[PDB]
């Protein structure tokens, strides 16, 4: 998160950190707790990493350097990447993670309410992106959860800023004309939540951007309302 500020405990209790343990253990992406045993993230977090056994999920945390061998973590029982997701491409960048054991809810660890498919026509107005990714383009992973207030942009306006790419109806864009505020590398998979009628709702999943925080370059997110039939069929089928 480029241009954000430190978050507090209990502020974003659905935020989780997906970490890989290879020679070292490193935060790669965010995620959003959506039920006792389901986390929602971006499918590209898994590109090139063919086993779930390397992943550790951390929830109810604020500071990544607090994580030691004592910190409790969740393990992956299964990853459902959307069928039509194609590696290195940006469509259907969404995956569900079923955890091996259900998580108990605390003020520091609680799910985010999902929108309905019908909320796809809703224009939200107070949106926030959070995570531990870079604070600047070509930057580093942050220790304290960052949070930033970003305005959504219409898909037509976002399409004019990314003429080289096809920003579809299953994507949502957010950013300033001047740039400065955006998600970045390491924020991938995390929440874009908007407070609508006094309730936080998961509107996007952080997906990609031309660099980070650049002028007239809004970040692109998977639009969760367009995937609500897929989320309900895959978590219910399981």
- Would you name the residues annotated as active-site residues? 44, 93, 188
Rounded distance, CA 135 to CA 184, Å?
7
Backbone angles phi and psi of 231, in degrees to 5? -65, -50
Start-to-end CA span in the chain (Å): 34
Of 55, 63, 85, the closest CA to residue 11 belongs to: 63
Q: Over 133-188, what HEC string results?
A: CECCCCCCECCECEEEEECEECHHHHHHHCCCCCCCCCEEEECCCCCCCECCCCCC
Name the nearest CA neighbour of 150 among 126, 177, 118, 131: 126
CA distances (Å), origin 121, targets 27, 91, 113, 225, 226: 34, 20, 17, 9, 10
Counting every residue written for the chain, the total comes to: 238
Question: How far is 6 from 41, CA to CA, in rounded Å?
Answer: 22
Give the distance, in angstroms, between the CA of residue 218 and the centroid of all CA atoms in the same chain: 16
């Amino acid at each position: 998160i480029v241009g954000g500020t430190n978050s507090s405990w209990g502020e974003w209790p659905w935020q989780v950190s997906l970490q890989v343990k290879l020679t070292a253990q490193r935060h790669l992406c965010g995620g959003s707790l959506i039920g006792h045993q389901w986390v929602l993230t971006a499918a590209h977090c898994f590109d090139g990493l063919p086993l779930q056994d390397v992943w550790r999920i951390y929830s109810g945390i604020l500071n990544l350097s607090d994580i030691t061998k004592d910190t409790p973590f969740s393990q992956i029982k299964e990853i459902i990447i959307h069928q039509n997701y194609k590696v290195s491409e940006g469509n259907h960048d969404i995956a569900l993670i079923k955890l091996q054991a259900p998580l108990n809810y605390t003020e520091f660890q609680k799910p985010i309410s999902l929108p309905s498919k019908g909320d796809t026509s809703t224009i939200y107005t107070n949106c926030w992106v959070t995570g531990w990714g870079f604070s600047k383009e070509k930057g580093e992973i942050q220790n304290i959860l960052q949070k930033v207030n970003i305005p959504l942009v219409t898909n037509e306006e976002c399409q004019k800023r990314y003429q080289d790419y096809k920003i579809t109806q299953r994507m949502v864009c957010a950013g300033y004309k001047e740039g400065g505020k955006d998600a970045c590398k390491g924020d991938s998979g995390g929440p874009l939540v908007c407070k609508h009628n006094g309730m936080w709702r998961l509107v996007g999943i952080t997906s990609w951007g031309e660099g980070c925080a650049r002028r007239e370059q809004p970040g692109v997110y998977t639009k969760v309302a367009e995937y609500m039939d897929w989320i309900l069929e895959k978590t219910q089928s399981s």
